[PDB]
Amino acid sequence: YADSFVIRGDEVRQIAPGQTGNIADYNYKLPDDFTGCVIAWNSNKLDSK
Amino acid sequence: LDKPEAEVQIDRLITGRLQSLQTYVTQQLIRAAEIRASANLAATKMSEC
């Protein structure tokens, strides 16, 4: 399953098991026993205006 | 502590406490053998004395 979304660079650390924060808690929560891979890249060239 | 960090500290506590129980039981089995032998001697003396 591929879950796609856009966040700030400083929020990237929240996309991980055992983490907390306003993304981890209110937007996208992973389980503590999460199995899978997290891939992220800078999209400033495409998404910023 | 965060989960993956807590699990390490908890694992140590479980191992130590479980090991302590194993030690306790082993010593009780050895002591039980000594007492059983004494009881057998007492039973013999009751019959013969």
Per residue, the 3-state secondary structure of B8-42, as one string, reads HHHHHHHHHHHHHHHHHHHHHHHHHHHHHHHHHHH
Q: Which amino acid is at A37?
A: C
Residue whose structure tokens are 């506590």: B13
- Alpha-carbon distance of B18 to B40, in angstroms, equals 33
Q: Output the six-digit token pair for B16.
A: 């130590």
Angle at B11 between CA B10 and CA B16, to 5 degrees: 100
Cβ–Cβ contact B3 with A under 8 A: yes
Residues whose CB falls within 8 Å of the CB of residue B33, separated by 6 or more in sequence, listed in order: none
Q: Fill in the DSSP letter of residue A24.
A: T
Identify from A14, A32, A34, A35 which residue to disrupt to test chain B contact, counting B C-beta atoms within 10 A and taking the largest count.
A32
- Alpha-carbon distance of A32 to A18, in angstroms, equals 5
Data resolution in angstroms = 3.1
Method of determination is cryo-EM
CB contact under 8 A, B3 and A19: no
